Design a binder for these strands. Structure first.
Ligand code: ZN
Lengths: 347, 134, 104, 131, 52, 194, 154
RNA sequence: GAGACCGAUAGCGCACAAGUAGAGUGAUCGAAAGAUGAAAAGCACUUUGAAAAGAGGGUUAAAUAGCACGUGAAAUUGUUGAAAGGGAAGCGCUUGUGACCAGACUUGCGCCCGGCGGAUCAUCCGGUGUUCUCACCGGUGCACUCCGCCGGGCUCAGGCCAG
RNA sequence: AAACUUUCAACAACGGAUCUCUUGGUUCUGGCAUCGAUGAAGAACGCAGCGAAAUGCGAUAAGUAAUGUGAAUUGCAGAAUUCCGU
C-alpha cells in the first residue's frame, strides 16, 4: 500500500476502509514480532546492535543542508565560513564592507536607546526589551497623540550627538511587538552604520513564564550559537556589539541567541553549577558522548527573561531604506523565494 | 462557436470521455509540441509522444530539465523522463509524472510510421496554405 | 450590434463578426427586442450600415396591422412647456418661496 | 481642522438589542427578534418586567441616522475608484474597505484616502509599517 | 410539464416595444446609461458605408 | 427629451448608479460635479452641463457640454484650462458659465475649491512621508505565515534549547574560560573538575 | 495586552497519548482525577494497588453507590470501587511517558503529572453501545529554582 | 443534442458492492454508503510495547490534509483559568466591582519678508490635434504677472466634557 | 479548607452541518427500426499468480481469426514477446 492509493483504485468507500483496517492490524502485528525477534538476537550477540545502529540512523534537515557549492562571500552566499578557511589552509569581504562592526576594539560601555513605533502603545514591552541590554534607556517616540512625528533618521542623529552607541526601535502590530530594528550609531566621524530589522514572533514576558525570576544588574554572558554563514556572522557580531564585552561573571546570568534553521531563539536564564542528583544522567555531547572532565555535575537553569523568536529580514547600508543612498543601499533583503526549499538556511 | 449537431458542448460528456478513454485515443490526447528547429524542418507542430523521444520540460517545478522518455503511462496521463525522479521515504527513487503538455520534443524516435505521420501533417498544412494563398 | 441589409450587403459580414466577443449581427428585416434591449434596459449601441438606413423606412411600412404610434405628448421637453413665454405670461404671482421661514 | 462637519448630538434611544423571547433558554432559537403570536404570551400583552417590543418610537433622529460616533456615514469601498467618489463628501462619509480586498489594493485605497482627506474605518488590517 | 412556460404577447405590443428600443438607440445618454463605453464614436446612430 | 431620459435613469436603471443603505445615492460618472444621483447633477439627463476635472500633469480643466453637439459623443465636451490663481480661476467660471443654472455655477466653484486644497494636502503629506521614510507594506501572506509557524515549531524541537545552554556552559568551565578562582562557581565544585 | 501562561519547554516535558482505548470513559475519568498532580512513583504505586484490590478509587462526578469502605477516609468520599482495566491502561500510558522522558534525557525520579485528560472515542457500532475513550498526559520535571547573586552598586 | 431542473437527508430505490447487502415459507419488501494531496512523495530509520496505540524523526506549500483523511457548525464531553453557590440561581430596568478588548479632532488653512525653480507670463519662435477657438508638445528668457519649494515672522480656526 | 454544581474563555474531543465540487439523476427535443427452434430474455457452472457484493469470455474460456492504428500493459510479480516491423 506504499506505492498505491486505495482511494484511487477502489471506488466503494466502505470496502476500502475495512481493507485499510485489516492492513493496520496486519502491519502492526508484523512489526511487533520482527522487532521482538531482533531484541532476542541482540541479547546474545550485542555486536549486531552496534552494526544496526551505525548503519540505520534517522534523517535530519540540518544534515541535509544545501550550501552554495561555489567560492566567494558577498553577504548573500550560503557557505560555511569556517570550512572555507579549513579548505584555504589545506571573512575579508565582511570586514571591508562593514569596517565598524568588525574593527579592532569596540567602545567599552555601549549606550543603547530603545524607542517604540510611532504613536505606539507597547511601552511595557519596550522597557523590558530595554532591560535585556545593559545600559539601555527607553524614550517614547511621540509625547502626545498630537505631537511632533520624529523620524528614525532624526533620532539616530540626536542620539549619536548625545553619545549613544545603538538605537533600537520596537515596531508593534496588534498591540504586540512584531519587528525589531537595530541601528548602529557608532562614534566620532564614521556615519551611522548598518540597520538590521528583525521579526519578533512569539513574544512572552518573564511574568508569563512559570517558575521565572528577576534579573539583577549584572552584565550577562553572551551565547551566540550556530551561526555559520557570512550573513549569520554579521548578525552574531551585531548582537555582540550591543552587550558589554567583559561579563560580570558573578551574577550567573546568561543571554542566548540560538540560530536553528534561520530562527534565532532568544532566552535569558540564570544558572548555578551543582552536583548531579543520583537519579540524573550525565551530560552527553554530540559525537563524543559522555563529556569528559565535567562528569557528574549539572548546570541548572531558571528563566529570568523574555521569550522571543527572531528572523532577519533586511540589512541596510545606513539608517533604514531612506537613509541608505548608494547603489549598494540594500545589503541583503529576505524574500520568500529563498525558503522555497526546506534545506536552504540563509543564516 | 460549435455548429455541427454531432459536436457536444457538455462538460459532463467531455469529462466522461476524457477519463474513460481507450488507450488508442489516449495516445492522441497524450501529445506534445515539437521544438522550433523541428517545426521549421518537418513543418509539423504536434505529434503524440512515444518511448524513444528526447524531450525538455518547460512547465512545473522541474523546468529546464532535458531527457529521454522512459515510460508513456496512458492510464494516468503521465510520461516519465530519465533522471527526473524523487526519493521515497525508503530512499528508492521513483519517476515523477509530467503531463505531455508540459514538455517540448527535441529529438524524435523515427520509424516508418513516424515519417508517415510527419508527412501527412505537412501535406495538409501545405495544402491549406496554398488554398488560402491562391 | 451590427445591423445590415441582406439584400445589398450579403451574409458574408456575419461570419467576420461571429468570433469577436460581444458583437452581434442582425438583419434589418428581423430586428430583435432581446438584442435591442438586453436585460430590459434600453439603449443598445448599434453600428448601422447605409443600406439599412434606407430600408428602415420600408420595413416599418410593410408591417401590416401596425403603424408608427402617435405619442400622447408632442413636446417631451417639459421645461419648454413650463418655462415658455405663453405659459409664464398668464400665471398668478408666487404664493411663497421654496423654503418657508419658521413663523413661531 | 480635519474632522466631521457640525452635527447635532447623536442620541441613541436604546443601546440594547431586542432579543427574542426565551432565546436565552433554548439553543435552537436564535437571538434574532421574532414577534410573539400567542394570545396568552406575557411579552405580547406587554406586562411589566418582560421584554419590550421594537416600535417606530425608538427610531433615531433623521439628521443623525446612519452616523458613526465620529459623525461620519460608512461607505463600503472596493477599489480606488470608490474613494474618489468621496472627493466632495470627505466631511460626511468615511471609507470602509471591504473585507475581500487584497493587501496591495488596500494600501492603494489608504494612500488615496489620505490624499483626499477621507477617514478610513479599517486602515490597519492587512498592512504594516516598514521604516 | 404543463406549467405555462411560454407567454403570448400581442404583435402590436411587440412592434411598439421594438420601435421604442430603436428610438432609444438613437439617444446618446441612453447608450452610456446602458454600460456601453461610447465616448469615441463620432455620431450616435453611427451609419457606416455599405461599400466597406 | 431630457425629462424622458431622467425617467429611465432614475426609475429603471443607470450604469453609473451606486446605491448605499445610508440614504444617499451616488453617481459613478467621471463627469459629475458631485457624485450624487440627483436631477440637477446628472451628466446624462442634463443636455447642457459643466464640470471640473484634474489632469495628472496637475492642470484643472473646465468641461462644458452643449446640446447642439449631443448627437456626437466624441465631440461632446470642450476643455478649457483654468488658471492657477484661485480668484482668477473663480472668475473664469463666472464668465464662462454665464447664463447657466446656479447649481452648476455653484458646484463648479466648489469642485474647484476641493481640487486645489487636495493638491496642497498632497504636497504636505508627500513632504512628511519623505521625512519619516516609513512606508506601508503588505503583511505576511496566510500561506507563508502558516509555513513559518510550522517550521518554527520544528526548529524549536530541534534546538533543544535548555540542553544546549547547559552543554555550552559546561564546556566553558572545562576549557578554563571562566579563569582561576571563578565567581561563577563553588570552590568545592572546581576541585571535582581536576 | 494580556499574555497567556506560556508552555513549559518541550525538552523539560514528556508526552504520551492513548487513542480509541477499549475502556470505559466514566471509569477512566474518575481514575485519572485520582492521580492528577502526583509524583510519577506515587502514581505507579497507587494504580498497582488498585490492580491488587488494595486501595480504592473514589467516585466523585460519575459516582455510583457501590462500596462504602474505610479506604475512602483518605479521600473524604463515601463511594469507592476498584477500576482494574482503567488502572491497567493508565499504567501503560504512564510507563510510556517515563520511557519517553528517558529518551529525551530527563530525571526519572522527579516527574510530576501536570496534565491528564480523558476524552471520548467514537462509539463501537454493534441496541447496546460501548463507551471507549482517548487519554493524553504530560509529565514535567519539578520546577528548579536557583539562587540570586547579591546586586552590585556602581 | 439540449435545460432559468436537482446537487449526496437532494436528484431515479441506486453518483459507490444497488435491485446489491439484509428480511420473509412464499408472493414480495429492500437500505446505508461520494470529496487525502498537484503528485503517494501513503511516514524510511531510532525507541516504547501485544495496539485500529505513543514519543522522536521524515515527506509536503501545508500532516491542527496520515487511506479515522477538503471545510469541519450545534447538541454533548474532558483539561486549564476566573468567579459564584447550598433546594440557590436563569428573564426586565439601573448602577457597582473584577477581567479582557477598543482607543477620542483624519488634528490645518491663511497673510508678510528673502532666495531658488517652473509656467497658463512674453503682443517670442516652431509644430500637432481639434468641436475652428480651443487644447497639447519642442526651443527660448525672467521686464511684468502667477504658481510651487526652501529659510524666517505673524495671525486665525479647531473635536469632546465640565464650571 | 476540600470536593460537587453552575457560567464564561482558551485548548482538546464527539458528530458530520455549512461552503465548494460532480464519469449521477430528472425533463425536453431530434435521427433510425434490430430478439427467439440457425435456440432469445433469464438461471447456474467454470476461465486471471495474488481478485469481487465487478467486468469480459466459454474447455479456442479477462479470449482466437480479420481490418485499422502504430509502440505498449502497469497495484506488484512476470514475458530473449515485439521496434524501418504482417
Ligand atoms: Zn444618475
Amino acid at each position: 500500500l506504499s506505492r498505491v492509493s486505495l482511494a484511487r483504485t477502489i471506488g466503494n468507500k466502505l470496502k476500502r476502509q475495512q481493507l485499510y483496517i485489516q492492513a493496520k492490524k496486519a502491519n502492526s502485528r508484523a512489526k511487533h514480532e520482527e522487532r521482538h525477534r531482533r531484541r532476542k538476537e541482540e541479547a546474545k550477540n550485542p555486536e549486531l546492535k552496534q552494526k544496526r545502529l551505525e548503519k540505520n540512523q534517522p534523517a535530519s534537515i540540518d544534515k541535509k543542508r544545501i550550501w552554495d557549492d561555489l567560492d566567494d562571500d558577498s553577504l548573500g552566499a550560503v557557505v560555511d565560513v569556517a570550512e572555507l578557511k579549513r579548505r584555504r589552509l589545506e571573512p575579508d569581504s565582511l570586514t571591508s564592507q562593514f569596517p565598524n562592526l568588525f574593527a579592532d576594539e569596540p567602545p567599552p560601555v555601549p549606550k543603547i536607546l530603545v524607542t517604540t513605533g510611532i504613536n505606539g502603545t507597547i511601552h511595557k514591552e519596550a522597557e523590558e526589551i530595554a532591560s535585556i541590554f545593559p545600559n539601555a534607556t527607553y524614550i517614547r517616540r511621540t509625547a502626545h497623540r498630537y505631537a511632533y512625528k520624529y523620524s528614525v533618521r532624526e533620532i539616530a542623529k540626536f542620539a549619536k550627538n548625545r553619545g549613544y552607541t545603538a538605537l533600537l526601535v520596537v515596531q508593534e502590530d496588534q498591540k504586540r511587538p512584531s519587528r525589531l530594528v537595530v541601528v548602529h550609531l557608532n562614534g566620532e566621524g564614521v556615519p551611522p552604520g548598518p540597520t538590521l530589522t528583525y521579526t519578533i514572533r512569539n513574544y512572552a514576558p518573564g511574568k508569563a513564564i512559570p517558575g521565572h525570576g528577576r534579573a539583577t544588574n549584572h552584565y550577562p554572558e553572551l551565547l551566540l550559537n550556530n551561526f555559520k554563514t557570512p550573513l549569520g556572522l554579521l548578525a552574531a557580531k551585531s548582537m555582540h556589539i550591543l552587550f558589554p564585552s567583559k561579563p560580570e561573571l558573578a551574577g550567573r546570568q546568561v543571554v542566548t541567541l540560538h540560530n536553528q534553521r534561520d530562527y534565532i531563539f532568544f532566552r535569558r536564564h540564570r544558572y548555578v553549577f551543582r552536583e548531579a542528583r543520583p537519579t540524573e544522567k550525565n551530560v552527553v555531547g554530540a559525537d563524543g558522548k559522555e563529556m569528559e572532565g565535567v562528569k557528574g555535575i549539572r548546570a541548572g537553569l531558571q528563566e529570568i527573561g523574555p521569550r522571543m523568536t527572531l528572523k532577519l529580514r533586511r540589512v541596510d547600508k545606513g539608517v533604514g531604506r531612506a537613509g541608505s543612498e548608494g547603489p549598494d543601499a540594500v545589503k541583503w533583503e529576505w524574500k520568500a523565494k529563498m525558503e522555497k526549499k526546506r534545506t536552504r538556511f540563509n543564516l | 462557436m460549435k455548429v455541427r449537431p454531432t459536436v457536444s458542448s457538455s462538460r459532463r460528456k467531455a469529462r466522461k470521455a476524457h477519463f474513460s478513454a481507450p488507450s488508442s485515443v489516449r495516445r492522441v490526447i497524450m501529445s506534445a509540441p515539437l521544438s522550433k528547429e523541428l517545426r521549421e524542418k518537418y513543418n509539423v507542430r504536434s505529434i503524440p509522444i512515444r518511448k524513444g523521444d528526447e524531450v525538455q520540460i518547460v512547465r512545473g517545478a522541474h523546468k529546464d530539465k532535458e531527457g529521454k522518455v522512459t515510460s508513456v503511462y496512458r492510464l494516468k496521463y503521465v510520461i516519465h523522463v530519465e533522471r527526473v525522479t524523487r526519493e521515497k521515504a525508503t530512499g528508492q527513487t521513483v519517476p515523477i509524472g509530467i503531463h505531455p503538455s508540459n514538455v517540448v520534443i527535441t529529438k524524435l524516435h523515427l520509424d516508418k510510421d513516424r515519417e508517415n505521420i510527419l508527412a501527412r501533417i505537412k501535406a495538409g498544412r501545405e495544402q491549406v496554405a496554398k488554398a488560402k494563398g491562391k | 450590434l451590427i445591423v445590415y441589409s441582406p439584400e445589398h450587403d450579403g451574409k458574408e459580414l456575419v461570419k467576420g463578426f461571429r468570433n469577436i466577443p460581444g458583437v452581434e449581427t442582425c438583419p434589418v428585416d428581423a430586428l430583435n427586442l432581446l438584442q435591442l434591449a438586453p436585460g430590459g434596459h434600453l439603449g443598445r449601441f448599434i453600428v448601422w450600415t447605409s443600406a439599412a438606413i434606407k430600408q428602415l423606412d420600408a420595413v416599418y411600412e410593410s408591417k401590416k396591422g401596425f403603424f408608427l404610434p402617435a405619442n400622447i405628448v408632442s413636446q417631451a421637453d417639459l421645461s419648454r412647456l413650463i418655462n415658455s413665454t405663453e405659459i409664464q405670461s398668464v400665471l398668478r404671482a408666487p404664493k411663497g418661496e421654496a423654503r418657508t421661514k419658521r413663523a413661531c | 481642522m480635519v474632522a466631521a462637519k457640525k452635527h447635532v448630538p447623536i442620541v441613541k434611544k436604546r443601546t440594547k438589542r431586542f432579543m427574542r423571547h426565551q432565546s436565552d433558554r433554548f439553543k435552537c432559537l436564535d437571538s434574532a427578534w421574532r414577534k410573539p403570536k400567542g394570545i396568552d404570551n406575557r411579552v405580547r400583552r406587554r406586562f411589566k418586567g418582560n421584554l419590550a417590543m421594537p416600535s417606530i418610537g425608538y427610531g433615531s433622529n433623521k439628521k443623525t441616522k446612519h452616523m458613526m460616533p465620529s459623525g461620519h456615514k460608512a461607505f463600503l469601498v472596493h477599489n480606488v475608484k470608490d474613494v474618489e467618489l468621496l472627493l466632495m463628501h470627505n466631511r460626511t462619509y468615511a471609507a470602509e474597505i471591504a473585507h475581500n480586498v487584497s493587501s496591495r489594493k488596500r494600501i492603494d485605497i489608504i494612500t488615496r484616502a489620505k490624499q483626499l482627506g477621507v477617514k478610513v474605518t479599517n486602515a490597519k488590517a492587512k498592512v504594516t509599517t516598514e521604516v | 410539464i404543463w406549467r405555462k412556460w411560454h407567454v403570448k404577447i400581442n404583435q402590436g405590443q411587440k412592434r411598439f416595444a421594438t420601435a421604442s428600443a430603436l428610438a432609444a438607440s438613437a439617444v446618446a445618454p441612453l447608450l452610456m446609461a446602458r454600460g456601453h463605453q461610447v465616448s469615441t464614436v463620432p455620431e450616435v446612430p453611427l451609419v457606416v458605408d455599405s461599400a466597406a | 427629451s431630457d425629462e424622458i431620459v431622467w425617467q429611465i435613469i432614475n426609475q429603471q436603471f443607470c450604469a453609473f448608479k451606486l446605491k448605499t443603505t445610508k440614504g444617499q445615492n451616488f453617481c459613478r460618472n467621471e463627469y459629475s460635479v458631485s457624485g450624487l444621483c440627483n436631477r440637477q447633477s446628472c451628466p446624462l439627463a442634463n443636455s447642457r452641463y459643466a464640470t471640473v476635472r484634474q489632469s495628472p500633469k496637475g492642470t484643472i480643466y473646465l468641461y462644458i457640454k452643449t446640446i447642439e453637439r449631443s448627437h456626437m459623443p466624441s465631440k461632446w465636451w470642450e476643455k478649457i484650462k483654468l488658471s492657477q490663481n484661485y480668484q482668477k480661476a473663480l472668475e473664469q467660471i463666472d464668465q464662462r458659465l454665464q447664463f447657466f443654472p446656479k447649481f452648476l455655477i455653484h458646484k463648479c466653484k466648489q469642485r474647484l475649491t476641493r481640487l486645489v486644497q487636495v493638491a496642497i494636502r498632497m504636497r504636505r503629506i508627500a513632504a512628511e512621508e519623505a521625512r519619516l521614510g516609513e512606508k506601508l507594506v503588505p503583511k505576511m501572506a496566510p500561506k507563508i505565515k502558516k509555513r513559518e509557524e510550522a517550521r518554527e515549531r520544528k526548529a524549536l524541537a530541534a534546538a533543544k534549547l535548555e540542553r544546549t545552554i547547559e552543554r555550552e556552559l559546561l564546556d566553558r568551565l572545562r576549557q578554563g574560560a571562566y579563569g582561576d578562582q571563578p565567581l561563577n562557581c563553588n570552590p568545592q565544585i572546581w576541585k571535582k573538575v581536576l | 495586552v494580556r499574555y497567556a501562561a506560556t508552555e513549559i519547554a518541550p525538552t523539560k516535558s514528556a508526552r504520551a497519548r492513548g487513542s480509541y482505548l477499549r475502556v470505559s470513559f466514566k471509569n477512566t475519568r474518575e481514575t485519572a482525577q485520582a492521580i492528577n498532580g502526583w509524583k510519577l512513583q506515587r502514581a505507579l504505586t497507587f494504580l498497582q494497588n488498585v490492580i491488587d484490590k488494595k486501595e480504592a478509587v473514589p467516585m466523585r462526578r460519575y459516582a455510583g453507590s457501590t462500596g462504602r469502605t474505610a479506604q475512602g477516609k483518605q479521600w473524604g468520599v463515601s463511594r469507592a470501587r476498584w477500576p482494574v482495566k482503567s488502572a491497567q491502561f493508565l499504567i501503560g500510558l504512564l510507563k510510556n511517558a517515563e520511557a519517553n522522558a528517558d529518551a529525551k534525557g530527563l530525571d526519572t525520579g522527579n516527574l510530576i503529572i501536570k496534565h491528564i485528560q480523558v476524552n471520548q472515542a467514537p462509539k463501537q457500532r454493534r441496541p447496546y453501545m460501548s463507551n471507549p475513550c482517548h487519554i493524553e498526559l504530560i509529565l514535567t520535571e519539578a520546577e528548579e529554582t536557583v539562587q540570586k547573586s547579591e546586586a552590585v552598586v556602581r
